[PDB]
Amino acid sequence: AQWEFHPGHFWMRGKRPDKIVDYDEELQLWNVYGYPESAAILSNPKVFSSDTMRLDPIKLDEAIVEGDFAHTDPPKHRRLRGLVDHAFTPSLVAKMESRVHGIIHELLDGVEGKSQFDLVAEFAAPLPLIMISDLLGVPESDRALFRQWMDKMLDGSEKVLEQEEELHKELELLWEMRDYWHERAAESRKRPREDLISQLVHAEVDGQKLNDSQISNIANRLLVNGHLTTAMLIANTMLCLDAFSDQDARVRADRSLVPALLEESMRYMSPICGVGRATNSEVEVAGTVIPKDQLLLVWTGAANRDERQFEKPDVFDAGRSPNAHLGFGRGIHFCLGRQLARMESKAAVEILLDRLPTLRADPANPPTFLQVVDASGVATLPVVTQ
């Protein structure tokens, strides 16, 4: 029934926010919790900028953030995202679709003799890492390297002298990743393959193109945005199914519900539950006037429990309609990979139900939750096969 969430994620413990907007004196930032406010904010990029680092001293060199459109505003955002969407071709997308079943089955074969395991480590996490890697065109040998990379990034996210300390740590890993992708981009310029790096290298739009530094930073962004949130979606869903057994029977009796189940999992336990914005001018949100050049955190996780928007918000309802949650954001930064996340997670859940029909969450070994402030979800999920 009840679990051990990040201490900041009060909405997961059923608490309504005391105020729609408030200010954190210690961290010197603003929080927004309401759904219609969060939605208006995300829809208003010209006052609520995604260029958060302009507030944060010290700044990464331009070559390091070059092309990362998740932190860019229009008009440059429109151009960068345009080139990357062009490179996400219908061919590449269908290729991932045609592969997803075989990869799921291969993973599940690797635990066919185990009675107890961690669903995250054995399945929910490797599946989207393998899919995003395959998309980008990475050899099989290198996906261990990606695992190590993400592990490093999570350890830091969980954890002027110390201002420079953290700087070195972050840069040394981005250097390594950038150098990896530059080599891929260079190879694919000479001999293009059937993958996203090759499409990013040849993408041309009116009639702009990307250089290898931009391409490398884009690949890094897709990598970090891709797999861990998808892993949490899959694992959070199986956890919810385990805890709400009526919904479990409901879904097993009606496999048509799985797409709506995943959307309800998105809403109820949001893998990304907060996104950062910076204000360009003075604004009034709800009642509160927020000053210029302020960091604002938009808590999509909390907004997804807002009763002004959702009837019975703290009920998990596997067939919930309507369900316009903010799990993938809203507006111009609307999650670029959401169809891929939905495709992967649907296939994972469908096959889990069929192949491990007596699967249950390990009662002797409770789930651990990711202790990262802006992600709500399972870090480990011990399960038993019988």
225 touches ligand HEM by CB under 6 A: yes
132 touches ligand HEM by CB under 6 A: yes
Report how far residue 270's alpha carbon sits from residue 313's, in angstroms, rounded to the nearest whole number.
Answer: 13
Interface segment toward ligand HEM; rule CB under 6 A; list 26-34, 186-194, 269-277, 366-374:
269-277
One residue of 177, 197, 340, 379 binding ligand HEM per CB under 6 A: 340
Report how far residue 20's alpha carbon sits from residue 346's, in angstroms, rounded to the nearest whole number.
Answer: 34
Amino acid at 223: L
Report how far residue 184's alpha carbon sits from residue 212's, in angstroms, rounded to the nearest whole number.
Answer: 9
Residue pair 95/132 in contact (Cβ under 8 Å)? The answer is: no
Shortest distance in whole angstroms from residue 266 CB to ligand HEM? 7
Task: Indicate the angle between helix axes 126-136 and 212-243, nearest 10 degrees.
Answer: 150
Nearer to ligand HEM, 56 or 165 (CB): 56
To the question of whether residue 221 is assigned a binding role by annotation, the answer is no
Amino acid at 5: F
Question: How many residues are present in the chain?
Answer: 386
Interface segment toward ligand HEM; rule CB under 6 A; list 118-126, 199-207, 323-331, 352-360:
323-331
To the question of whether residue 6 is assigned a binding role by annotation, the answer is no
226 touches ligand HEM by CB under 6 A: yes
- Minimal CB distance to ligand HEM: which residue? 337
Interface segment toward ligand HEM; rule CB under 6 A; list 118-126, 161-169, 171-179, 228-236:
228-236
Nearer to ligand HEM, 267 or 364 (CB): 267
How many CA atoms are closer than 13 Å to the CA of 275, on its beta-carbon side?
26
222 touches ligand HEM by CB under 6 A: yes
Residue pair 30/22 in contact (Cβ under 8 Å)? The answer is: yes
To the question of whether residue 81 is assigned a binding role by annotation, the answer is yes
Binders of ligand HEM in range 57-86 (CB under 6 A): 69-70, 81
Shortest distance in whole angstroms from residue 87 CB to ligand HEM? 11
Nearer to ligand HEM, 10 or 299 (CB): 299
Question: Residue for token digits 């990040």?
Answer: 6
One residue of 178, 267, 333, 346 binding ligand HEM per CB under 6 A: 333
Q: Which helix (H) or strand (E) holds 189?
A: helix 161-190
To the question of whether residue 333 is assigned a binding role by annotation, the answer is yes
With a CB cutoff of 8 Å and minimum separation 6, the contacts of 361 are 238, 239, 242, 243, 367, 381, 382, 383, 384
Interface segment toward ligand HEM; rule CB under 6 A; list 251-259, 311-319, 333-341, 361-369:
333-341
Which of 93, 104, 132 minimizes the C-alpha distance to 352? 104
Residue 322 tokens, joined:
């309507």
Any alpha helices (H) in 110-142, and if so which ranges? 119, 126-136
Cα of 7 vs its chain's centroid, Å: 20
Cα of 368 vs its chain's centroid, Å: 18
To the question of whether residue 277 is assigned a binding role by annotation, the answer is yes
Shortest distance in whole angstroms from residue 39 CB to ligand HEM? 12
To the question of whether residue 325 is assigned a binding role by annotation, the answer is no
329 touches ligand HEM by CB under 6 A: yes
**Which residues fall in the annotated binding site?**
77, 81, 225, 277, 333, 335
Q: Which residues bind ligand HEM (CB under 6 A)?
A: 50, 69-70, 81, 132, 221-222, 225-226, 229-230, 233, 271-272, 275, 327-329, 333, 335-337, 340-341
